[PDB]
Amino acid sequence: QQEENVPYLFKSQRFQSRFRASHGDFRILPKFTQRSQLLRGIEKFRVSVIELEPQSFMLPHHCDGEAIFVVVRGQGTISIAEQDEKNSFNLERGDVLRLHGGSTIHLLNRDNNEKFFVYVLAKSVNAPGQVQEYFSAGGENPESFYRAFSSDILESAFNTQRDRIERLFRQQKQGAIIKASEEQIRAISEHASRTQGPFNLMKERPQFGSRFGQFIEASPERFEQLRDLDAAVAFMNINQGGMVLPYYNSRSTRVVMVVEGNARFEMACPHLGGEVHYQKVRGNLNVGDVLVIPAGHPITFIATGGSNFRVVGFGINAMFNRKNFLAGRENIWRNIDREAKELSFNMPGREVEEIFQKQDQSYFVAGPEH
Ligand SMILES: [Cu+2]
Ligand code: NA
């Protein structure tokens, strides 16, 4: 109800399936400007989810957006067909893959039991925010784009009698994500290991961490394959009963999707808030929900109880972004002098400092008893 009026919150139900598939789904959030011009700064970007059931195959297609795939759950093989090169990669949880726009891909989940789930960021190259799929594979369902060509053109192009080529493009009726056999799975992923492979930071030391949570990020400073989009991929885990201390991002807007657990968030927004007033922008986040955190906006997340709270965040305008913590042992006030603190709060500087030093921990701490 009220949460339908928080323009930064995109509940999971707002993701729209692009097709009706038996063995998975592909669902995409509307353009970010659908309900608010406050998100015009990220209009070119879309987020989506791909889900493959066990023993499933997503048919060959390309998109007209530059993408970043992040594996959230399971294992799957991506096969990429370019004009002059083939690549296949066996992806696992935490893998990040930059996929060039126009790359023809297919996906395979070889596992017998576990779903394969990918969170995707795409950026348009045609009309702003418009990202479309082009099924080369297919027939009647999904419709293959080859059916847009006249039969004489297909005959001449394929050097194949028109009735035979037209028949080829009518056989598939099962949809875009279908069953795959054990032998097909073997064959397709047999060679899997411009288009570089995935990277994975799961085993690295976090950038920021404590006993209550972890943050690590793939930045374009480090990963050249993210530089063109100027994107980052952030992984944040808040342990059960924890919170991330209030912080803000200096320049990067974040598109945060919940992968595990639940949290309460509170954000300070001057836009929705004449002299400045900060609107209290609040809600709850569940698995599959998205929150957009505009740059500069103070935010906190508080894990709510029975689970860790885990998110993947895409960062837009990521180069040169820095996290600025607003409480904790390591925070911005560490770099503000005592006299400036005294003037800031109209109280003795040593007293301000005493209060600001009470929190001995950094980054993530125990949340409120609630
Ligand atoms: Cu704002
Ligand atoms: Na489905």
DSSP 117-135: EEEEEEEESSSTT---EEE
**Where does the chain have alpha helices with state H?**
151-158, 162-168, 182-188, 338-345, 349-356
The number of the ligand nearest the C-alpha atom of 25 reads 2
Q: Is 242 helix (H, G, I), strand (E, B) or coil?
A: strand
Q: Using the mean position of ligand 2's atoms as its centre, give its distance from the Cα of residue 20 in Å.
A: 6
Q: Using the mean position of ligand 2's atoms as its centre, give its distance from the Cα of residue 144 in Å.
A: 19
Complete domains list, the chain, with CATH = 1-193 (2.60.120.10), 194-370 (2.60.120.10)
CA distance 37 to 309: 29
Locate 213 and state its tokens.
Answer: 């949570």
Locate 356 and state its tokens.
Answer: 């600001």
Peptide bond preceding 142: is omega within 30 degrees of 0, i.e. cis?
yes
Method by which the model was determined: X-ray
CA distance 10 to 293: 12
CA distance 131 to 114: 29
Q: Which of 227, 224, 195, 229 is CA-nearest to residue 44?
A: 229
CA distance 255 to 247: 16
Q: Using the mean position of ligand 2's atoms as its centre, give its distance from the Cα of residue 329 in Å.
A: 47
For helices 349-356 and 338-345, angle between their N-to-C axes, nearest 10 degrees: 100
Q: Using the mean position of ligand 1's atoms as its centre, give its distance from the Cα of residue 159 in Å.
A: 59
Q: Using the mean position of ligand 2's atoms as its centre, give its distance from the Cα of residue 50 in Å.
A: 10
Please report, for residues 61, 288, 300, 303, 340, the alpha-carbon distance to residue 284 in angstroms, rounded to integers and kept in the order given.
Answer: 36, 12, 12, 10, 36
CA 26 to chain centre: 14
Query: Do the Cβ atoms of 135 and 143 come closer than 8 Å?
Result: yes
The number of the ligand nearest the C-alpha atom of 296 reads 1
Give the experimental resolution in Å. Answer: 1.5
> For the chain, how many helices (H) and strands (E)?
5, 25
Beta-bridge mates of residue 217: 234
The number of the ligand nearest the C-alpha atom of 24 reads 2
Residue 329, CB half-sphere, CA atoms under 13 Å: how many? 8
Query: Do the Cβ atoms of 14 and 46 come closer than 8 Å?
Result: no
DSSP state of 144: P
The number of the ligand nearest the C-alpha atom of 53 reads 2
Locate 5 and state its tokens.
Answer: 């009026």
Q: Using the mean position of ligand 1's atoms as its centre, give its distance from the Cα of residue 233 in Å.
A: 22
Instruction: Give the number of other CB atoms < 10 A from CB of residue 239.
Output: 20
Furthest CA-CA distance within the chain = 89
